[PDB]
Design a protein around this ligand. Structure first.
Ligand SMILES: Cc1cc2nc3c(=O)[nH]c(=O)nc-3n(C[C@H](O)[C@H](O)[C@H](O)COP(=O)(O)OP(=O)(O)OC[C@H]3O[C@@H](n4cnc5c(N)ncnc54)[C@H](O)[C@@H]3O)c2cc1C
Ligand SMILES: Cc1cc2nc3c(=O)[nH]c(=O)nc-3n(C[C@H](O)[C@H](O)[C@H](O)COP(=O)(O)OP(=O)(O)OC[C@H]3O[C@@H](n4cnc5c(N)ncnc54)[C@H](O)[C@@H]3O)c2cc1C
Ligand SMILES: O=C1Oc2ccccc2C(=O)C1CC1C(=O)Oc2ccccc2C1=O
Ligand SMILES: O=C1Oc2ccccc2C(=O)C1CC1C(=O)Oc2ccccc2C1=O
Lengths: 273, 273
């Protein structure tokens, strides 16, 4: 079960429906006994740019500065900047991580992206030796709560923007699952800019209604890492037994692991029935 | 033909391969008669966070602030933040926009994502009435030049990161193609952190070659806007006649337009033969 929950919001206006959603989640989660902690990126005036200032003290190779190594080193010896360390503290303690933000240019707002690049340091959020399903945040569950200007049909298979599942992949898979996170069904609240009041009220209440049991939900599907040869010799390719056995399957495994076949419907929006 | 190019660099180190790719692209482009203009985001101390300070004027509704509407008005009247106006001015002048950068968390660097969000302002870079191929930059050609830590076999259909094509989709369709840009094939340089010295030199060399005739190449394939009814009524869905006609094609039109079928090989990486 979960006790602690971290809500990371990415939005400047407090009058925004996004801000409303964050409160709605804290309210609802508290009532159920969760200890909520917040990360109001804009309110915290968070720094989204990685640089040799995230490492406090002498770098190992000042001439040739390599962010990864330096910050992995800094994490180990305790020289990460206070603000990055702070966020890594909330996370370390969180069981459930909610990401609330408006969809911008088909991704997380720049400030949220920067948050990941700085907070998710190696050794802390990931190691090559244990990527994906075997990562550090594997004991935690995360969730995207996105708001979009476009209608949900623009994001449908025949939608002019294309399958919302492809858009989601880079984030739920590339960023979240790559660290061990169990990714729950995203809370997609389409066309918010064109939703009436009564409709908007209901939305909030639904989000809260969902959050009262968010933890017992079955997570989205991702190809287990046991299906690959996680060694460089193999180039991290999908095991030969698996490759062959999968050939009789009409559907691929996930959006990313489509194998040039048919992507399973809503692989990134709905958890396996 | 093109006489003006804009090279956008998103890396903090001048000792970096990315910075070297940036010099190569200019030295090559200029030598062939181009007028190169750069935007070294980091070197510029570029602010990636969209806020109201981006609008130096009287907001239409300061109480309930909304970046889209407010940012557009600022562009129309002319009180946008000087730095942004400076950028946009580089984009009106460019025929070719090159985006040099290290793939990070399966996407563009936060600072770069900030750039799109602040500079690509409605009316300037796009309008709902003119989505995609009808966009304002339809006479411009863009190209992503990405380097990664991971081996190309990791981004293979069988790789543990999944089809690289899915990862590139959000950027090339969502951000660049939405604005009208014709997207050229992405110059992908996998595991640059493992490439031998001689190959690194060849990669630089090769990059300079392609650049020689980068403007006559055939662009990546996107579903033309003419395949969709583009009115909030019909839901911006793919026309009826069109749907029925595609029922007979083995492959989907693109990554985000796979229509549940197989995705055409390297739809977002290789142009059509
Ligand atoms: C840079 C940028 C990039 C974008 N890129 C994309 C993109 O790629 N794809 C896309 O689809 N969209 C995109 N958008 C649109 C964006 O996703 C939406 O404008 C945003 O998600 C709307 O969320 P909001 O809360 O900020 O809305 P806010 O406008 O009275 O408001 C929505 C409504 O909620 C109401 N409201 C506020 N609080 C409450 C409350 N407590 N209870 C009830 N009602 C309330 C408001 O009054 C308002 O009418 C982009 C916008 C920007 C600025
Ligand atoms: C937050 C974050 C997220 C990341 N996410 C991902 C991801 O999702 N997927 C992924 O695959 N990778 C990822 N990476 C790894 C990243 O993509 C690579 O480290 C980066 O692209 C390497 O490019 P560089 O220009 O910095 O390299 P730089 O290390 O001697 O160097 C590359 C090589 O080029 C050499 N070199 C430098 N200048 C020159 C020159 N002028 N001529 C010839 N050789 C030269 C260098 O000495 C070096 O050996 C991530 C890194 C970070 C920090
Ligand atoms: O809110 C909208 O209003 C519209 C009205 C008429 C016709 C089409 C649209 C849209 O596609 C969107 C969504 C939308 C938006 O509000 O902002 C964006 C910024 C960058 C890229 C994509 C988008 C969008 O798809
Ligand atoms: O350097 C990286 O940093 C990352 C940061 C966030 C998300 C993804 C990645 C990566 O895929 C790689 C590539 C990557 C690499 O450069 O070296 C390796 C060595 C052994 C096993 C696996 C790998 C990798 O996946």
């Amino acid at each position: 079960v979960g006790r602690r929950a971290l809500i990371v919001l990415a939005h400047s206006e407090r009058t925004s429906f996004n801000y409303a959603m964050k409160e709605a989640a804290a309210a609802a989660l508290k009532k159920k006994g969760w200890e909520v902690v917040e990360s109001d990126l804009y309110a915290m005036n968070f720094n989204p740019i990685i640089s040799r200032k995230d490492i406090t003290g002498k770098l190992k190779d000042p001439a040739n500065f390599q962010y990864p190594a330096e910050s992995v080193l800094a994490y180990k010896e305790g020289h990460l900047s206070p603000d990055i360390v702070a966020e890594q503290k909330k996370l370390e303690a969180a069981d459930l991580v909610i990401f609330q933000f408006p969809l911008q240019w088909f991704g997380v707002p720049a400030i949220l992206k920067g948050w990941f690049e700085r907070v998710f340091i190696g050794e802390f959020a990931y190691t090559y030796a244990a990527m994906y399903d075997k990562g550090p945040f594997r004991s935690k569950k995360a969730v995207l709560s996105i708001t979009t200007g476009g209608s949900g049909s623009m994001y449908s298979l025949q939608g002019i923007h294309g399958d919302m599942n492809v858009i989601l992949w880079p984030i739920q898979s590339g960023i979240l699952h790559f660290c061990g996170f169990q990714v729950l069904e995203p809370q997609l609240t389409y066309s918010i800019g064109h939703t009436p009041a009564d409709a908007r009220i209901q939305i909030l209440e639904g989000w809260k209604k969902r959050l009262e049991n968010i933890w017992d939900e079955t997570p989205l599907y991702f190809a287990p890492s046991s299906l690959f040869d996680l060694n460089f010799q193999a180039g991290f390719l999908m095991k030969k037994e698996v490759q062959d056995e999968e050939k009789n399957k009409k559907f691929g495994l996930s959006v990313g692991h489509h194998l040039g076949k048919s992507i399973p419907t809503d692989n990134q929006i709905k958890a396996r029935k």
